[PDB]
From a paper:
By contrast, in vertebrates the clustered protocadherins (Pcdhs) provide analogous cell-surface diversity, but in this case generated through stochastic alternative promoter choice. Biophysical measurements with domain-deleted proteins showed that Pcdhs also interact in cis, through a membrane-proximal dimer interface involving extracellular cadherin domain 6 (EC6) and potentially EC5. The specificity-determining cell-cell recognition interface of Pcdhs involves domains EC1–4, as shown experimentally through mutagenesis analysis and suggested by mutation correlation analysis.
Crystallization screening of these dimeric γ-Pcdh fragments yielded crystals of γA1EC1–4, γA8EC1–4, γA9EC1–5, γB2EC1–5, and γB7EC1–4, and their structures were determined by molecular replacement. The γB2EC1–5 and γB7EC1–4trans dimer structures show the same overall arrangement as the previously published γB3EC1–4 trans dimer structure. For example, EC2:EC3 interacting residues 111 and 294 in the majority of γB2 orthologs (not including mouse) are lysine and aspartic acid, which are likely to form a salt bridge in the trans homodimer, whilst in γB3 and γB7 residue 111 is a conserved glutamic acid, which in the homodimeric complexes interacts favorably with H/R294 in γB3 or S294 in γB7. However hypothetical heterodimers between γB2 and γB3 or γB7 would juxtapose like charges E111 (γB3/7):D294 (γB2) and K111 (γB2):H/R294 (γB3) which would disfavor the heterophilic interactions (γB7 numbering). (E) Structural alignment of the overlapping EC3–5 regions of the γB2EC1–5 dimer with the γB2EC3–6 structure provides a model for the overall architecture of γB EC1–6 dimers.
Residue numbers in the entry:
A (entry chain A): 1 to 526
B (entry chain B): 2 to 527
Write the structure that this text describes.
Amino acid sequence: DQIRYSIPEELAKNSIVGNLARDLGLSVQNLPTRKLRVSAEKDYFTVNPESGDLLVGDRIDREQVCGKQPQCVLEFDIVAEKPLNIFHVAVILQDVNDNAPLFKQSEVDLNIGESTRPGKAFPLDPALDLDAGSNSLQKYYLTDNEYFEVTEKETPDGRKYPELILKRFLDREEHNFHQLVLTAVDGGDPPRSGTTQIRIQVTDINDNPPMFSQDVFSVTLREDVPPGFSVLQVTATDQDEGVNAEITYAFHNVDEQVERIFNLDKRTGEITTKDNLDFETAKSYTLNVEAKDPGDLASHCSIQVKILDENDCVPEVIVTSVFTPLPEDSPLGTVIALIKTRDRDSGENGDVYCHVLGNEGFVLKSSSKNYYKLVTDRTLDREAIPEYNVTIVAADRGKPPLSSNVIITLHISDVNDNAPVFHQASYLVHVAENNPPGTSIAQVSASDPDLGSNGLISYSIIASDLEPRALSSFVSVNQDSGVVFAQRAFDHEQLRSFQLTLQARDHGSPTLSANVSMRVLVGDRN
Amino acid sequence: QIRYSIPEELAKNSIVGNLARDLGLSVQNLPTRKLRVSAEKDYFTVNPESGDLLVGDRIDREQVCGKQPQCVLEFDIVAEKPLNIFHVAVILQDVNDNAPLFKQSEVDLNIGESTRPGKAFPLDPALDLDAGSNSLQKYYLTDNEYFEVTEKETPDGRKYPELILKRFLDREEHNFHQLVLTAVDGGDPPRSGTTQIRIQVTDINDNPPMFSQDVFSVTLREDVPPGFSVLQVTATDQDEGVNAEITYAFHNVDEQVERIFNLDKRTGEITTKDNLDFETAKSYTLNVEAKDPGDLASHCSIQVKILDENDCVPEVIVTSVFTPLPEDSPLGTVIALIKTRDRDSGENGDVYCHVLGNEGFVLKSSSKNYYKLVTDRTLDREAIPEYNVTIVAADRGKPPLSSNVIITLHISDVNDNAPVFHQASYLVHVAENNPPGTSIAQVSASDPDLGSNGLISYSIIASDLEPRALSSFVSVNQDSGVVFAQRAFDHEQLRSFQLTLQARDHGSPTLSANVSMRVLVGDRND
Ligand SMILES: *[C@@H]1O[C@H](CO[C@@H]2O[C@@H](C)[C@@H](O)[C@@H](O)[C@@H]2O)[C@@H](O[C@@H]2O[C@H](CO)[C@@H](O[C@@H]3O[C@H](CO)[C@@H](O)[C@H](O)[C@@H]3O)[C@H](O)[C@H]2NC(C)=O)[C@H](O)[C@H]1NC(C)=O
Ligand SMILES: *[C@@H]1O[C@H](CO)[C@@H](O)[C@H](O)[C@H]1NC(C)=O
Ligand SMILES: *[C@@H]1O[C@H](CO)[C@@H](O)[C@H](O)[C@H]1NC(C)=O
Ligand SMILES: *[C@@H]1O[C@H](CO)[C@@H](O)[C@H](O)[C@H]1NC(C)=O
Ligand SMILES: *[C@H]1O[C@H](CO)[C@@H](O)[C@H](O)[C@@H]1O
Ligand SMILES: *[C@H]1O[C@H](CO)[C@@H](O)[C@H](O)[C@@H]1O
Ligand SMILES: *[C@H]1O[C@H](CO)[C@@H](O)[C@H](O)[C@@H]1O
Ligand SMILES: *[C@H]1O[C@H](CO)[C@@H](O)[C@H](O)[C@@H]1O
Ligand SMILES: *[C@H]1O[C@H](CO)[C@@H](O)[C@H](O)[C@@H]1O
Ligand SMILES: *[C@H]1O[C@H](CO)[C@@H](O)[C@H](O)[C@@H]1O
Ligand SMILES: *[C@H]1O[C@H](CO)[C@@H](O)[C@H](O)[C@@H]1O
Ligand SMILES: *[C@H]1O[C@H](CO)[C@@H](O)[C@H](O)[C@@H]1O
Ligand SMILES: *[C@H]1O[C@H](CO)[C@@H](O)[C@H](O)[C@@H]1O
Ligand SMILES: *[C@H]1O[C@H](CO)[C@@H](O)[C@H](O)[C@@H]1O
Ligand SMILES: *[C@H]1O[C@H](CO)[C@@H](O)[C@H](O)[C@@H]1O
Ligand SMILES: [Ca+2]
Ligand SMILES: [Ca+2]
Ligand SMILES: [Ca+2]
Ligand SMILES: [Ca+2]
Ligand SMILES: [Ca+2]
Ligand SMILES: [Ca+2]
Ligand SMILES: [Ca+2]
Ligand SMILES: [Ca+2]
Ligand SMILES: [Ca+2]
Ligand SMILES: [Ca+2]
Ligand SMILES: [Ca+2]
Ligand SMILES: [Ca+2]
Ligand SMILES: [Ca+2]
Ligand SMILES: [Ca+2]
Ligand SMILES: [Ca+2]
Ligand SMILES: [Ca+2]
Ligand SMILES: [Ca+2]
Ligand SMILES: [Ca+2]
Ligand SMILES: [Ca+2]
Ligand SMILES: [Ca+2]
Ligand SMILES: [Ca+2]
Ligand SMILES: [Ca+2]
Ligand SMILES: [Ca+2]
Ligand SMILES: [Ca+2]
Ligand SMILES: [Ca+2]
Ligand SMILES: [Ca+2]
């Protein structure tokens, strides 16, 4: 059972709310009789007795009293004495738009993932406008931009708050961060705004792979670089940050020897040899390097290594045929030996010239490159020079040159080209009469410089002035020793001297001979 | 040089050609000149009797020539006595006997989930040791929606097969792929070589954590201790590894939510770290955010409601009391004004009052929660001057709680009792010739009132004697009530006289009582 009065809030103190003396039917003289008083938990109002009307007391701030409540009603009692009575009074106060909507924080900073799907919603803390009705918050709206949208969400249960609807994919390598201005507006005359700034810092995720500076590189090396030689350092650039920017390098899809010879450090990306190179084994290597982050995004490159040749192989002289023993009557230009040269190098380091040392009558003639023949230049002789030590030298054209020599041993075989020569130009022997038959009266001798059969000497009597049927009856000759024998006792009174033609013969093809004349003189006795 | 041409992989003793007829030699002299072959390897052997060239060891063209399109073998023939050398070259024509072949039958690649389309992946090529059209000519691949196959030629001329990607991968849809790569040459019949490529997609942090449902509902009784298991919340990330470990935390919350509740960052489990009260806050809106290391997050809210428990005792307040209370107070007169306050809500905060005992006071409720203590009995201070009215209030919750107060009432006196004489009439005998100024009688009266209202003062208002001589006969002491004789009495003159006294109270207004007194003058002899 109450009466109701209406005023605006924040009203001036001691402003009349209304006269209760008229509404409660109390004479102005009947009233001071009565203690008129206000009973309330917090004294927002008081009454002057002599006045008989209601008076505003303390600060009547609606927002600290009713809060959000749609209608604001202050219930309090009024006490009167003689007779004792309690009257009930409640006042309605109208809302004043004296509070503007304001966000809790001046700046809010969000971390939004780079790969957040579009349309995803991010709830935002709502502003606080303590007024009620139309004077409360009505419209959120955000900075016009292309990346983000704002909408006011109200769940069917009751609570409401604004949220960000993402418009498109983010990309920290395009924009590291954005800053936007959100405005909250209430709906009365005149509207009151409150702004806040949102800074969104995009966080890195893995979407860019390491990339090499070029598709292909090139380096060259001498084939004598020691193990550990820095060949080439490769690097890749990853546009991400954090662990999604760590780069690992590795050999992949390389021949076995390519991986065995070289060595690539995973973290640094530098390539150094681990063993000796050899141009004769591999003229060049090709290299493929894989660079990848932990997210297995990769890019690959190819480095081509071209080795350069060095003069490190000695030329070799191969001799494939030789003429031994060599007959001394061999004509000019006969081919004695077959010569080839092999140098595993390349270019001028493998180009070889061949010479024969000395001038003993042997020269090299070249039919074609690396092919030679060792011919005779002058006539030969075994009794002069029986044996030859022929040195052939091959030399390359590298700087400095590398040489090699070989020694061929030629033996000269005997040809029957020397006739036997008698020790004396003629022979003359003195045999005394009445000599014993079958004794040594003389001994011819010859000499032959040839070897073996071509130097074996046989002696024979070819002619004499005596009766041919009686020659053997007089003297004879030993074919093996040359000693001459008498086969009958000589008689001076019958014949004093006789003539003999002795012959020296060898055993060759053909046989060579020589004639000597021996005269036998028979001494005289009785 | 003599040029020939034969197919590879011919059987031994096969005739290549008759060099006796081709060199220009004579078959009569072929036995004397050893015809022989000098060469690096014993691929061939001539017969000196027949003078022809036989194949020796197997001549595998791919074991000699390799990459060279046309392959020639150059070897020498030595003669002897006469001694010469002859140059021959045999062309090895290619027989398609080698098929394309891969180093590994199965290759395993790791491709990140976010390789942009068109990214080329260079694969290990196939080896076709043949040359010409019989060498490798094209690559083919299983028809799928994700990968195409190409063959790229570096300007150097090295050819390699690279894969091209046409559609974004997704391991949450297809963890890995199995493909078939074939290599085809250009002979008839064409020989093919296959390999199986198992491509494995690597996890990339592309999916955010997500909750079962956006809003949860729980209720808590307000008397739960600190540390009560409120709720456990979990989220599921569709990724793997470090990309799928979750961190939960509060997000845009009131200070009180952070002071009362403790949420495990690792478990998503909320408990309370303080005591709750229903009268302070009836509900709590919690906002939880679950985020992965990539700052991808989803948000849910837990709307907690609080249950009221009866813990506030009801309070009785006596706004005003009416004491002292006049004993002439009519019925239904208001004594004390009462109000009731219980901070609980519902039946726990619904208070009702009643008076203990029965002594003439009843509680009439003008409105809900307000009482007037009125009288239903006429009071009398001479009977009961003090009252100790005990008022009790209780609530209708389970279990209920009550409280009492003791009002003390003092009863004000009112002059509501006139004095009464202890006797109805007075008859007094006086002897004759009594001394003037002697006590003849004494009257008495009583008044139960308090103080001046109970003070009695006597007087003689009237008598039958002439009023001028009344002062000469009798008198009364107003304090003691004694009736004295003011003269000597003579029986022969007057035998008896009557009298009319009054007993009066002193409080205003005065209450009086009249009494009659008869005086008989006794008779002596004079
Ligand atoms: C109305 O009630 C009052 C107060 O009663 C108080 O509360 C009750 C629940 C009981 O527990 C009472 O014992 C308690 O005092 C009564 O007044 C009280 O009366 C008693 C007895 O007459 C007084 O006791 C005296 O106390 C003093 C010391 O203060 C001693 O020296 C005395 O020897 C004697 O023990 C008590 O003081 C008094 N209290 C007050 C505040 O006056 C009252 O009698 C009662 N009236 C009726 C009609 O019931
Ligand atoms: C040839 O050389 C060998 C080896 O030293 C030697 O024994 C021989 O006497 C030499 N002959 C000539 C003729 O120089
Ligand atoms: C030696 O004598 C024989 C026989 O009379 C003769 O044929 C020859 O010419 C002579 N001279 C030589 C040198 O042999
Ligand atoms: C007592 O008597 C006097 C005179 O006779 C009279 O006026 C008075 O009213 C009487 N008392 C009462 C209580 O009536
Ligand atoms: C917000 O916007 C209002 C108009 O809607 C302005 O009046 C105010 O100053 C604030 O900028
Ligand atoms: C909201 O935003 C504006 C800038 O748009 C500030 O000037 C203002 O103080 C509040 O931070
Ligand atoms: C190793 O070191 C050499 C210099 O010594 C560099 O030229 C090379 O690129 C690699 O870094
Ligand atoms: C090159 O030098 C060597 C010695 O180092 C000789 O043996 C060779 O004959 C040529 O002169
Ligand atoms: C035999 O003996 C004689 C000596 O009487 C020599 O003169 C002769 O030459 C042969 O030796
Ligand atoms: C590879 O492909 C060829 C046809 O190009 C077939 O002949 C062979 O059997 C293999 O399938
Ligand atoms: C290549 O593919 C074939 C089937 O097409 C297999 O049989 C072979 O072993 C290789 O995996
Ligand atoms: C503690 O235990 C309760 C059940 O007793 C759960 O509901 C809560 O989520 C927490 O795990
Ligand atoms: C009021 O009533 C409650 C029970 O409702 C009691 O516990 C209390 O002592 C008082 O009598
Ligand atoms: C005065 O005294 C006499 C006795 O002396 C009493 O009889 C009389 O009633 C009054 O008290
Ligand atoms: C009359 O006198 C008696 C004593 O005799 C008192 O008790 C009474 O109150 C009245 O005054
Ligand atoms: Ca205000
Ligand atoms: Ca306001
Ligand atoms: Ca406002
Ligand atoms: Ca990016
Ligand atoms: Ca990366
Ligand atoms: Ca990135
Ligand atoms: Ca070398
Ligand atoms: Ca070399
Ligand atoms: Ca060399
Ligand atoms: Ca000679
Ligand atoms: Ca000779
Ligand atoms: Ca000779
Ligand atoms: Ca073959
Ligand atoms: Ca072949
Ligand atoms: Ca083939
Ligand atoms: Ca995915
Ligand atoms: Ca993923
Ligand atoms: Ca994830
Ligand atoms: Ca409580
Ligand atoms: Ca409670
Ligand atoms: Ca309660
Ligand atoms: Ca009374
Ligand atoms: Ca009284
Ligand atoms: Ca009285
Ligand atoms: Ca008398
Ligand atoms: Ca008398």
